[PDB]
Paper text:
Although aPKC–Par6 phosphorylates Lgl at three serine sites to exclude it from the apical domain, aPKC–Par6 and Lgl paradoxically form a stable kinase–substrate complex, with conflicting roles proposed for Par6. Lgl has a double β-propeller structure and contains multiple phosphorylation sites for aPKC–Par6, with at least three serine phospho-acceptor sites (S655, S659 and S663 in human Llgl1, within a segment defined hereafter as the P-site) that map within a key membrane-binding loop13. The structure reveals the intricate interplay between aPKC–Par6 and its substrate Lgl, which, together with in vitro and in vivo data, supports a capture-and-release mechanism involving a stable phospho-intermediate.
The structure of the human aPKCι–Par6α–Llgl1 polarity complex was then determined at a nominal resolution of 3.44 Å using cryo-electron microscopy (cryo-EM). The nucleotide pocket was occupied with adenylyl imidodiphosphate (AMP-PNP) added to the sample before grid preparation to stabilize the kinase core. Two known phospho-threonine sites in aPKC (aPKCιpT412 and aPKCι pT564) and one phospho-serine in Llgl1 (Llgl1pS663) were unequivocally identified from the cryo-EM map. The second β-propeller of Llgl1 makes the largest contact with an aPKC-isozyme specific sequence insert (residues G457–D468). A second Llgl1–aPKCιKD contact involves the aPKC RIPR motif (residues R480–R483) in the loop between the αG-helix and αH-helix, also at the base of the kinase C-lobe. The C terminus of the Llgl1 loop (10–11) is bound to the Par6αPDZ domain through a previously unrecognized internal PDZ-binding motif (Llgl1PBM) spanning residues V706–P712. The phospho-S663 site (Llgl1pS663) identified in the cryo-EM potential map forms a salt bridge with Llgl1R661, which packs against the Llgl1F664 side chain. By forming the plug domain around Llgl1pS663, the P-site effectively blocks access of S655 and S659 phospho-acceptor sites to the aPKCι substrate cleft and catalytic residues.
Residue numbers in the entry:
A (entry chain I): 248 to 585
B (entry chain P): 154 to 180, 186 to 252
C (entry chain L): 15 to 122, 139 to 420, 427 to 485, 495 to 667, 704 to 761, 771 to 951
The structure:
């Protein structure tokens, strides 16, 4: 049965908030996969066991879509909690943005449309993805996006219902969350508007504002007020159609936003001029051609990841020294298997 | 109050060994309080032993904390950081 | 102390400047000739004439959208998203004329309108019903009420079978005669109804969903709009009562799907063609998202296209019943970010300039600068440049300004994301725009970009950004010789001469490497701007002497000039340098980074930036949160940022010779003092004095040298201005340094703690900004001592007395919450300050007891 001894650990390819991603190989069947590690000692809250349990339920509901990632194996050995998942051959979209800085409109349109199909699949099934992020978006070897951390999602949402928990990464939280409103999947379309600006401009629209440096600038108390109260401005170099998409998702009122209507919303996303160029049926299929194909160097494309990770040492961190008295050794069972 | 604890200058590389939190305390007179929470390994607070993750802090350097926020008390301890005194309530540790 | 302090300082706020944030309601009164604006924050401001302002702010800070004036009377009605309505009343408090709340109303909600001569108000709700109120005493009249069943009793033959009448909407007032009200129901049904006889005078049919009604002063015809892009025009006479089909009904933009029309005004009864003005109606398939007002007269239709959402609009016209003309002189429109007014006398309908309520925000405000006691020669040169770069009537002209003519010409000047500097009349009650300099003209562009709707673009507000690194990071101005320094996000720094003549010249550009001898970390961030080569035409006004550039194009966190010496200093996230503009060679450059780093040499997006967590009951999941406690260290933060750049003539080497010196200051708590050798074939040389290293490593925020009389060193070229400015030299100087958590002063030939004060030890605090100021006494102003004012991270201002470092006062100027307001501050040299309570508005505070300001107005009620 599944357990840590069978998979050999090649290199760390991502350090996240609460998790370590390793490239891992098998010999019994010769294939290679990513494996994400959570620390059972870290997920010790009642809310922590809920978010890590519900993360299994999102893979359970996301059983097949081309733009998500599938749970291929799961195991819970030695104070660690393992999800084995499709290896992304092309890195995250954030590293691609470091290399490129700015995407031309032909490149940026493709990624936002594929991310819209992925987002709509979660919403339609009953999931709010809650944490769209420029590094949660990933590339295949052919460049198609995958959307890939399911930790903070809202499970089981009925169409037209809402949630009240405060959640998501600070640069991408939607205004209705910070107000304390009850919110629907309008928040995921807000986070797409932010990410589209970051692709096309090369900078956050909700950056730390272009005034001169001060402490209490890198605080979320500053950023949350910047996103609530400040106006947002599009670079005047952008095509008029691209500006209109960004404005229409960037609307601070969820009822006004492009895509946020409780029935016809995605049909407006299909009908908007920027999107009018692209065939949504061919875009779910193999048949659309991506504009950029990521690296084929190294044994497995290890170069695509951050130097901070692709030079890290390979062990699980050496031991639970003294922590070994405190740790859990059974409670997370039942979400151990596919 | 039970005791006021000297936390020393390190004279060396070793940090002071704490993280602190907000919370609440009571006698029926429920009120906000600031607490010790993580005695981090290899920091000089661990050399003193009278501290615990259980404990409320009542004064910093002989000034009463009672009205301050947690963001104000980490200010009152990022400076003021070469010659700490902290005053703590429970004598019985219960 | 025995209260001697009270002659020097006491704390006040003054009324704000610039356009209001989140506008929401409007009113205008043709008989007082005053305008009012209501706002989502619950504010009720009034803007009657040049230098006239008033401001209400309700008991409850709820959003509003309805306002009406009692035309010619001291009172106004304002409607909240709540059930409540309440009456605002204006009173001539003997000096300080002001608006205050009279009475409150409640019901067990949607629109209100008022009547002249037959003095009555009428309200409409979300249920299909109308109610009447005598504004003299806030209650309904219990008999004058109009339920859906009563208005249904009339029923046309299609509606006889149905009771499902839609929401009440668009109550419209009377039309010369005193007793008729016009009523809309969103279903599409329209009625005219009599108060004095409690009956329908006419019905008007309608079938599609409604959203406008209008009256014409001669009631021969009336116009209405529908929430589908249509409008119904109708005529009226005593035989027309069955109203079978509309008279001129149309949709103004073709066969297409064309949105909704949310308001119409009718001005047809004048001489000439049929003036109609309407909001919305644009074809949704091609012009859907944008915000526009269409004006029609005869064959001339234009659409006015605005850079922000339309709130409301009004036309300048006469309410005198004996008049026969609709007299549309000018049209005024409230956008979400600007108020515009346009005059319709000549074809193409020109925009009208505004004396007040300017859109300060029109490019985002990146910095605040202030200069005080400005020379009349400079001010005349600046306004001459302003007027050289820049029927004509202003309609809103009601009440009168009672305040004094300026006895102290203060200038506040501001830098913007567009790379532009704006100059503003900070003296007295309100700002006025003087001049606008564009730095952007120097730099090449790295990137680059009637029909069916008859479009013309209007309003000064711009919703686009030109370039992220044209933005002005710091400004400083040298009054006494008309030179200015401006510093930008890509390491650019310009020094400019004021030259009130148009001329063509090529700048000299220099570049300085902060890490010249230090090994190169790899800068992958902002690529540097390229200045356009060869000669360039420049306007009469500020013109660049020279450009200086930094090797890493980081934000220029500090800049200063000392014009007598002809030096400028500039400082970044990574290092600082000195430059002499007289002979173009750089004086020095120095790197002050730690030999390894994190928050440097990077693009605008990065993985490493961790955001310090909130402590609110908003912003976290429901309840403890961790903060650590730790002594500061040499790599704990972006430690190479340069905060101070200061010039002084002071005894640093030895007590005999008064040598000219420059002081850097850094996030590390390193204070590199330098001695300088100014010549009068040769150029300025610089050598390091004593590096002062702080005991707590907290960032230095300000440095000031106290002359041995306890008075700060003067401003640079002040030898042209006074005798009294001439400093002590016989007593040895002390240097005052402000760190983010404590203040110290030191004796310059031997740095030793003369005085010290530690704020944060006594109470949890931090210092954001510091400046030194003088406090002339309210009487016997001969007593005019000096103090430093410091801005707390909690928004409090504290005043400290130099050299003694004793806290004189403890005042709650700004709240904890508005961190962007705290970060925006500038201090005037007389204990007064400006801060941005909105990106749209400056608020002003004064802590000097002698320098104070109040509302001071009168009006013919
Ligand atoms: N399947 C994968 N293939 C390749 N790289 C991956 C894969 N899954 C995650 N990564 C990388 O690992 C990083 C962090 O993994 P992630 O699953 O997002 O951890 P996390 O803690 O949930 N991150 P975060 O979203 O920031 O909280 C990502 O940003 C990617 O760079």
């Amino acid at each position: 049965s599944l357990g840590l001894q069978d998979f050999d650990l090649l290199r760390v390819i991502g350090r996240g908030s609460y998790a370590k991603v390793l490239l891992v190989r098998l010999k019994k069947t010769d294939r290679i996969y990513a494996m994400k590690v959570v620390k059972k000692e870290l997920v010790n809250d009642d809310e922590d066991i809920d978010w890590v349990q519900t993360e299994k339920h999102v893979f359970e509901q996301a059983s097949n879509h081309p733009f998500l990632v599938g749970l291929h194996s799961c195991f819970q050995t030695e104070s660690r909690l393992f999800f084995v998942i499709e290896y992304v051959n092309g890195g995250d979209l954030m590293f691609h943005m470091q290399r490129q800085r700015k995407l031309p409109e032909e490149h940026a349109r493709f990624y936002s449309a594929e991310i819209s199909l992925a987002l709509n699949y979660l919403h339609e099934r009953g999931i709010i993805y809650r944490d769209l992020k420029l590094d949660n978006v990933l590339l295949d070897s052919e460049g198609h996006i995958k959307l890939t951390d399911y930790g903070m999602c809202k499970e089981g949402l009925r169409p037209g219902d809402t949630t009240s928990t405060f959640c998501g990464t600070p640069n991408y939280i939607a205004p209705e969350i910070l107000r304390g409103e009850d919110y629907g999947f309008s928040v995921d379309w807000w986070a797409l508007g932010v990410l589209m600006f970051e692709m096309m401009a090369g900078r956050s629209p909700f950056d730390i504002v272009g005034s001169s440096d001060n402490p209490d600038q890198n605080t979320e108390d500053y950023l949350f007020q910047v996103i609530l109260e400040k106006q947002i401005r599009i670079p005047r170099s952008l095509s008029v159609k691209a500006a209109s998409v960004l404005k229409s998702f960037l609307n601070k009122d969820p009822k006004e936003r492009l895509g946020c209507h409780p029935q016809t919303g995605f049909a407006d996303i299909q009908g908007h001029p920027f999107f009018r160029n692209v065939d949504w049926d061919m875009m779910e299929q193999k048949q659309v051609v991506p504009p950029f194909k990521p690296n084929i160097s190294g044994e497995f494309g290890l170069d695509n990841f951050d130097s901070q990770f692709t030079n890290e040492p390979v062990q699980l961190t050496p031991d639970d020294d003294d922590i070994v008295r405190k740790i859990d050794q059974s409670e997370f069972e039942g979400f151990e298997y596919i | 109050t039970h005791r006021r604890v000297r936390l020393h200058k390190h004279g060396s590389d070793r940090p002071l060994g704490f993280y602190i939190r907000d919370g609440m305390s009571v006698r029926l007179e429920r009120v906000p309080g600031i607490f010790i929470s993580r005695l981090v390994r290899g920091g000089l607070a661990e050399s003193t032993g009278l501290l615990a993750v259980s404990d409320e802090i009542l004064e910093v350097n002989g000034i009463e904390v009672a009205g301050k926020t947690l963001d104000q008390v980490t200010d009152m301890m990022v400076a003021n950081s070469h010659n700490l005194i902290v005053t703590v309530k429970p004598a019985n540790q219960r | 102390r025995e209260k001697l302090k009270q002659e020097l300082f006491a704390f006040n706020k003054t009324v704000e400047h610039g356009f209001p944030n989140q506008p929401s309601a409007l009113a205008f009164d043709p008989e007082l000739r005053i305008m009012a604006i209501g706002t989502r924050s619950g504010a009720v401001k009034i803007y009657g004439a040049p230098g006239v302002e008033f401001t209400g702010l309700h008991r409850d800070a709820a959003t509003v959208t309805q306002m009406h004036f009692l035309t010619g009377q001291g009172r106004l009605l304002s409607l909240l998203d709540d059930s409540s309505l309440h009456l605002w009343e204006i009173v001539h408090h003997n000096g300080c004329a002001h608006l205050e709340e009279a009475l409150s109303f409640q019901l067990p909600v949607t629109v209100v309108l008022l009547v002249a001569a037959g003095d009555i108000a009428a309200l409409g709700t979300e249920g299909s019903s109308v109610f009447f109120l005598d504004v003299t005493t806030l209650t309904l009249l219990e008999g004058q009420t109009l339920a859906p069943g009563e208005v249904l009793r009339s029923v046309p033959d299609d509606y006889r079978c149905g009771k499902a009448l839609g929401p009440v909407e668009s109550l419209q007032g009377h039309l010369r005669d005193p007793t008729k009200i016009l009523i809309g129901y969103s279903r599409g049904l329209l009625v005219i109804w009599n108060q004095a006889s409690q009956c329908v005078d006419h019905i008007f049919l309608g079938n599609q969903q409604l959203e406008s009604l209008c009256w014409g002063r001669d009631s021969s015809t009336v116009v209405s709009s529908h929430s589908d892009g249509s409008y119904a025009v109708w005529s009226v006479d005593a035989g027309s009562f069955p109203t079978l089909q509309p008279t001129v009904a149309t949709t103004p933009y073709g066969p297409f799907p064309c949105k909704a029309i949310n308001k119409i005004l009718w001005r047809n009864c004048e001489s000439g063609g049929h003036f109609i003005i309407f909001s919305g109606g644009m074809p949704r398939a091609s012009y859907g998202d944008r915000h526009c007002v269409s004006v029609l007269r005869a064959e001339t239709l234009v659409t006015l296209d605005f850079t922000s959402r339309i709130i409301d609009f009004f036309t300048v016209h006469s309410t005198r019943p004996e008049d026969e003309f609709d007299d549309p002189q000018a049209l005024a429109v409230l956008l979400e970010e600007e108020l515009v007014v346009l005059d319709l006398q000549t074809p193409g309908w020109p925009a009208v300039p505004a004396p007040y309520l300017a859109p300060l925000h029109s490019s985002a405000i990146t910095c605040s600068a202030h200069v005080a006691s400005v020379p009349a020669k400079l001010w005349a040169r600046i306004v001459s440049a302003g007027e050289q770069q820049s029927a004509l009537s202003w309609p809103i002209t009601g009440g009168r300004n009672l305040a004094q003519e300026p006895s102290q010409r203060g200038l506040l000047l501001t830098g913007h994301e567009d790379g532009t500097v704006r100059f503003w009349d900070a003296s007295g009650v309100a700002l006025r725009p003087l001049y606008k300099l564009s730095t952007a003209g120097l730099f090449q562009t790295d990137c680059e970009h009637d029909d069916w709707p008859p479009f013309r673009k209007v309003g000064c507000f711009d919703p686009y950004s030109d370039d992220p690194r044209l933005g002005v990071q710091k400004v400083a101005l040298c009054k006494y010789t008309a030179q200015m320094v401006v510093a930008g996000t890509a390491g650019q720094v310009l020094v400019l001469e004021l030259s009130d003549v148009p001329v063509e010249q090529a700048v000299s550009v220099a570049i300085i490497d902060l890490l010249q001898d230090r090994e190169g970390f790899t800068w992958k961030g902002h690529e540097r701007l390229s200045p356009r080569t060869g000669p360039l035409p420049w306007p009469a006004g500020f013109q660049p002497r020279v450009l200086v550039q930094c090797l890493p194009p980081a934000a220029v966190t500090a800049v200063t000039l000392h014009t007598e010496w002809s030096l400028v200093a500039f400082g970044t996230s990574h290092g600082f340098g000195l430059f002499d503009y007289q002979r173009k060679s750089p004086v020095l450059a120095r790197c002050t980074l730690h030999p390894n780093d994190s928050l440097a040499m990077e693009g605008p997006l990065s993985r490493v930036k961790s955001l310090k967590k909130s402590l609110r009951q908003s912003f976290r999941r429901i309840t403890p949160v961790q903060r650590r406690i730790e002594p500061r260290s040499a790599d704990d933060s972006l430690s190479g940022v340069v905060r101070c750049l200061y010039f002084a003539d002071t005894f640093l080497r030895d007590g005999a010779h008064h040598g000219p010196t420059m002081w850097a200051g850094t996030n590390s708590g390193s204070v590199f003092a330098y001695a300088l050798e100014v010549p009068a074939e040769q150029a300025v040389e610089a050598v390091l004095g004593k590096e002062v290293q702080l005991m707590h490593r907290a960032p230095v925020v300000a440095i000031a040298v106290l002359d041995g009389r306890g008075r700060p060193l003067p401003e640079p070229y002040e030898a042209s201005r006074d005798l009294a400015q001439a400093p002590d030299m016989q007593g040895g100087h002390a240097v005052l340094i402000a760190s983010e958590e404590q203040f110290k002063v030191f004796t310059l030939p031997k740095v030793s703690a003369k005085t010290k004060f530690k704020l944060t030890a006594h109470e949890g605090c931090r210092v954001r900004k510091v400046a030194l100021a003088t406090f002339a006494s309210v009487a016997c102003e001969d007593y005019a001592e000096t103090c430093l004012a410091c801005l707390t991270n909690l928004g409090d201002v504290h005043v400290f007395s130099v050299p003694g470092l004793r806290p004189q006062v403890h005042y709650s100027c700004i709240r904890k919450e508005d961190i962007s307001g705290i970060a925006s501050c500038v201090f005037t040299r007389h204990g007064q300050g400006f801060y941005l309570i909105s990106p749209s508005e400056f608020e002003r505070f004064s802590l000097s007891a002698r320098n104070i300001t109040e509302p001071l107005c009168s009006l013919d009620i």
